[PDB]
Design a protein around this ligand. Structure first.
Ligand SMILES: [Mg+2]
Ligand SMILES: [Mg+2]
Ligand code: NA
Length: 326
DNA sequence: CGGCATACG
DNA sequence: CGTAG
DNA sequence: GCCG
């Protein structure tokens, strides 16, 4: 088992779902208390379990697995012995965890805002609605649409959304292309938003595109919320039988020179990207982001024509998107 | 022990 | 601060 | 919380 998540295939569905989930609760809780290091270890440990070829049935099968020390091993031990881990259950039940989860789920609310509201004594969505003067415009939208945004989007919904985006993009800039990214590109059948990456085959033609796309979607009556420039975090109106529902959609523009880096980043998973960037810097001495890959010795950027190029330049075996579910 | 990814709105 | 993966 |  390699130590970095970008060195091993991780499928969407696996053989250790219950164990990985328990560890992810502890990761989430660590994030709610600002402990990014502990969050990372519990996430990495969970991801190692997703990468295994069969179920963990005995404690000895953890020996030699990276990111399993005393704490993560104890969690697995208790689950294997009793079907339940007391620490995990205490977190699940806690007022702190439940409220921080509720508040951070709101579009426009992060850990820092959620924590302050918790410390002020706020516990429910209606507590927030009673004091609307304190909310940002973004948080008001997030709270108004919270119910719809809590409901997952299906792949058929995504195909409908892609068509409307493509129409707007075609008017904004003939020849521009729209690529589905995020979890749906990794093979997810459901998800809580939709991500699109937009480019144009002629370098430079994409400059100023996103405002033009947004203005056109606005005029079509499809945009329930947006900020107004290369990333737009929107709430879209999605048709349903006899009605519609609000859906989170992100639109991103990149020049075609940067497209492979943007595609890689926006395809995820989050942990996969963090691990890939960590690997790049710490093992290869190269700096990776969603725009490029920089050699700080030569002071040059690596030209990539494909994701395959990027994996090769980092000395990693290629993983297709459906194996990046770290 | 230091480090933990790296951006844009 | 929020957002993204 | 774990790794190097
Ligand atoms: Mg997504
Ligand atoms: Mg998104
Ligand atoms: Na949030």
């Amino acid at each position: 088992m390699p130590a970095y998540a970008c060195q091993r295939p991780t499928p969407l569905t696996h053989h250790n779902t219950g164990l990985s989930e328990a560890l992810e609760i502890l990761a989430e809780a660590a994030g709610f208390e600002g402990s990014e290091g502990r969050l990372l270890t519990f996430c990495r440990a969970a991801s190692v379990l997703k990468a295994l070829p069969s179920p963990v049935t005995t404690l000895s099968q953890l020996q030699g697995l990276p990111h399993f020390g005393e704490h993560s091993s104890r969690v697995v031990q208790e689950l294997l012995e009793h079907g339940v881990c007391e620490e995990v259950e205490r977190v699940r039940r806690s007022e702190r965890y439940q409220t921080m989860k509720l508040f951070t789920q709101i579009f426009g609310v992060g850990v820092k805002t959620a924590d302050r509201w918790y410390r002020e004594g706020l516990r429910t969505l209606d507590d927030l609605r009673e004091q609307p003067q304190k909310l940002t415009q973004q948080q008001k939208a997030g709270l108004q649409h919270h119910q719809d945004l809590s409901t997952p989007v299906l792949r058929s919904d995504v195909d409908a959304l892609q068509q409307v985006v493509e129409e707007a993009v075609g008017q904004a800039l003939p020849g521009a292309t729209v690529t589905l990214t995020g979890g749906f590109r990794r093979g997810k059948l459901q998800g809580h938003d939709v991500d699109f990456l937009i480019t144009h085959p002629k370098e430079g033609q994409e400059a100023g595109l996103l405002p033009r796309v947004m203005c056109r979607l606005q005029d079509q009556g499809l945009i329930l919320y947006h900020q107004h420039f290369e990333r737009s975090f929107c709430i879209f109106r999605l048709p349903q039988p006899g009605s519609w529902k609000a859906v989170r959609v992100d639109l991103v523009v990149a020049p075609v020179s940067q497209f492979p880096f943007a595609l890689l980043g926006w395809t995820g998973s989050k942990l996969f990207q963090r691990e890939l960037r960590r690997f790049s810097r710490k093992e290869k001495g190269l700096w990776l982001n969603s725009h490029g890959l920089f050699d700080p010795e030569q002071k040059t950027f690596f030209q990539a024509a494909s994701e395959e190029d990027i994996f090769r330049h980092l000395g990693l075996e290629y993983l297709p998107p459906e194996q990046r579910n770290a």
